[PDB]
């Protein structure tokens, strides 16, 4: 594998270069929206984002070494966690608001249910801000989610390779923190702080997946074929 031979700095460069673009929504402040339309904006946006995520995943060192069957599984497991962490990252510098798109910033006051999830996403964003989370750290965290979220629900040699890459990413994170002037105690503490946030991201994803199932069955808010398929995987 080539992933195993990367230096920390090379790992970081590779991840940064692989970042997907920030997409726009179809929000129009002059147009009336309903709970349904406002949601259609989020689902339409998520659908277009997925295509970029899939292509992003292939550039995550280690990912393409896996069988197509396993790549599919990892993305089905992690897609909402990944959308969500990206959203929280985009929202860091916008206290009290979620920046779904440069032209779509929503506050808590914006839907029926979902406010609970919004609130959690806001807390996570505030958390990143307080920690002064760095972009280099963010892209590591996002790759960890991709590889880790489905790893325990699949040769299980494939699993070993994933664990090795995962260890490499930990090495990279520590490397970044050392280079930032953190003491060893500080590095370990910050590493843990970052990784515990992933539990919260998992929680938000799980709760969102349930909310999305209701929306589907309600059959009012539009959902692309790919999104329906990604949802089915969790059910």
């Amino acid at each position: 594998s080539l992933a195993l031979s990367l230096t920390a700095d090379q790992m970081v460069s590779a991840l940064l270069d692989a970042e997907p673009p920030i997409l726009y929504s179809e929000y129009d402040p002059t147009r009336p929206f309903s709970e349904a339309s406002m949601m259609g904006l989020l689902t339409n946006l998520a659908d277009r984002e997925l295509v970029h995520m899939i292509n992003w995943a292939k550039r995550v060192p280690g990912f393409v070494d896996l069988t197509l069957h396993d790549q599919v599984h990892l993305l089905e497991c992690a897609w909402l966690e990944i959308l969500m962490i990206g959203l929280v990252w985009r929202s860091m510098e916008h206290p009290g608001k979620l920046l779904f798109a440069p032209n779509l910033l929503l506050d808590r006051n914006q839907v029926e249910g979902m406010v609970e999830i919004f609130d959690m996403l806001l807390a996570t964003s505030s958390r990143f801000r307080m920690m002064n989370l760095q972009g280099e750290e963010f892209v590591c965290l996002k790759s960890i989610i991709l590889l880790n979220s489905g790893v325990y629900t699949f040769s299980l040699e494939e699993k070993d390779h994933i664990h090795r890459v995962l260890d490499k990413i930990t090495d990279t994170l520590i490397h970044l923190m050392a280079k930032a002037g953190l003491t060893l105690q500080q590095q370990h503490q910050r590493l843990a702080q970052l990784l515990l946030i992933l539990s919260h991201i998992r929680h938000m994803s799980n709760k969102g997946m349930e909310h999305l199932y209701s929306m589907k069955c309600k059959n009012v808010v539009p959902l692309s074929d790919l999104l329906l398929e990604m949802l089915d995987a969790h059910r």
Binding site: V51, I54, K58, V72, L75, L226
Partner: peptide, 9 residues
């Protein structure tokens, strides 16, 4: 599967 298709070219 769409995701499977997109993953392979």
């Amino acid at each position: 599967k769409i995701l499977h298709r997109l993953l392979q070219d």
